[PDB]
Symmetry: C2
Subunit: 344 residues, 2 copies
């Protein structure tokens, strides 16, 4: 039925008192603790996103997921997202294949744009080439996973002339999800390819995205892709506490500081509590409150999307570790059983 998981970018203080090294080490300590607890309370997936900024510690999700692999038993381990357009698909495949071996078949790649642009100047790419870079590198990533020895050529990556890529993973077909978007063009591309898609619901009302899944399914059905192979996920922000009032009070500040920073860099004004209270209402984008309320919204959202997977981002900005740990607990032991029993 429904897969339930978590994802995070592993935020840090951009100006720590005792320097960026100790801050990073602390954050990664805490992050592993999050992943270990999520595994222990039976959550299905944990995602880590790639960023290239002083306020995030994870620029290499596969490296951190290798550590998670050997400290967990069941939880699936994915990027969320890999900014594939600015990386080398051979390296990405090798890294995730290695995580797959370390985790006994639990690795996945989620590839997409992300909402940040720091990777392009860092790695020497022009954003005007995003679409070609992503198309070619995704094509190459898919060729790599489909067989040991590949022959590939394009315009944006050197040719590969009948060479094996090692090591081979454990899974027959290492899963690759495409993170969209919210642009009809993006979902139809992925649909026509028969690839699973993950939709970030970032603001506004969640049901406004329903046509995107319609379009995904139509692009697939059109291209004669087998209905039953298609998977969909929604990736949302939110938080769970012992009461809805406590979830709201705890999440508001840490969350606002991040979403204000993002707005500044994208050209919009700061958030407020009224916007936040609207967002956490039944139709809003934020999946937030006591376990019962959050469970109810996940079930309702499924009525709308018929999504196979749901990923929740709670660890945002300077959310206290203890609060995140309690939220992960409540998500696994209270929210998940309610969702799972209704959707089975």
């Amino acid at each position: 039925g429904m897969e339930l998981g978590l994802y995070t970018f592993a935020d840090v203080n951009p100006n720590p008192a005792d320097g960026r090294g100790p801050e990073g080490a602390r954050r990664l300590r805490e992050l592993l603790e999050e992943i270990e607890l999520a595994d222990q309370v039976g959550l299905d997936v944990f995602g880590l996103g790639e960023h290239h900024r002083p306020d995030y510690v994870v620029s290499s999700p596969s490296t951190v997921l290798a550590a998670a692999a050997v400290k967990t038993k069941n939880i699936r381990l994915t990027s969320a997202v890999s900014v594939l357009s600015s990386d080398d698909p051979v390296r990405v495949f090798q890294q995730f294949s290695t995580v797959d071996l370390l985790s006994n078949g639990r690795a996945e790649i989620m590839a997409g744009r992300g909402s940040f642009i720091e990777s392009y100047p860092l790695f020497g790419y022009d954003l005007e080439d995003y679409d070609v870079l992503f198309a070619e590198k995704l094509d190459l990533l898919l060729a790599l996973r489909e067989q040991e020895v590949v022959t590939w050529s394009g315009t944006k990556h050197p040719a590969i002339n009948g060479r094996g890529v090692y090591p081979r993973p454990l899974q027959e077909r290492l899963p690759v999800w495409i993170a969209v978007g919210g642009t009809p063009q993006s979902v139809a591309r992925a649909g026509a390819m028969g690839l699973p898609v993950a939709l970030a619901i970032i603001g506004g009302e969640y049901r406004r995205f329903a046509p995107l899944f319609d379009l995904y399914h139509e692009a697939a059905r059109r291209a004669g892709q087998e209905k039953t192979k298609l998977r969909t996920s929604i990736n949302v922000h939110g938080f769970i506490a012992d009461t809805t009032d406590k979830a709201a009070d705890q999440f508001y500040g840490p969350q606002a500081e991040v979403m204000n920073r993002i707005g500044r860099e994208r050209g919009w004004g700061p958030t407020n509590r009224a916007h936040f209270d609207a967002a956490r209402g039944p139709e809003g984008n934020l999946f937030l409150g006591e376990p019962e309320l959050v469970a109810e919204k996940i079930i309702k959202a499924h009525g709308v999307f018929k999504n196979d997977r749901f990923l929740l981002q709670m660890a945002i900005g300077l959310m206290p570790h203890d609060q995140i740990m309690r939220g992960i607990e409540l998500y696994g032991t209270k929210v998940a059983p309610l969702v799972r029993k209704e959707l089975t």
Copy 2:
């Protein structure tokens, strides 16, 4: 003091009965057990080399070292080697900085040629470009470790215009070692740049390599590099077991396929017993035998090289896991104390 460590390429059976996936999964589980034991018995360094072939499971040493980082306490964790010429130094720095954070300050990079010649086609390079690729990418890697925000340009890598590279590691200066095989040019360049060097001892009597370290120090002297920047290691093949005959038999046994690599690169065949026996004698390049024999050779080799670090590669070909585990135990509990007692006190 003397740092004593291990390195491996994490060889697998290229013809596994139950498929490449399960073979790779088992090899990495076994490798982690090796590293954890090495940590537990107090060995100083563990290295993993990068290869791109069906008979090696580690094409991404940093990925595996991340896992080692969270399963160990004291051991330092290094590539051996990172084939830097064919990689992106920004990614390499980010990956090893991440290992550094996960390990609380225990990561290192050892950059070298490794098997570039076999693996350059995968990354789109031309063989001729090795020297400029290595020079520029090493220059970038060192720029990255020296400060948060860099401006760098060259001919074989895109420009970086005032960009930060994250996350920052824990160590003030992420150690970068240069692996050298015994070509004067490589050794001298490392010395002139004041970087620690790790020399591979392959073939003949180990003594014959000593002048290479002369050249390293002389290049450093004439470049006016600080004496205290300079560190040297020797990287050797060998094996430790409960008796010298057991070590020899187990290392030479046909089923382990060690000699197919060890003898081949030294210019002799897998059943050339005369050469293997000469190679493992007191002056030879193979550090092999019961613990007291191996410790005495390490001590003697120090009198020759004055090396700061000694790295041993035992886990080669299809050496049985149990035998490697016993060798690691003997290395940390018998060999290391003898060497440390004699060299330090």
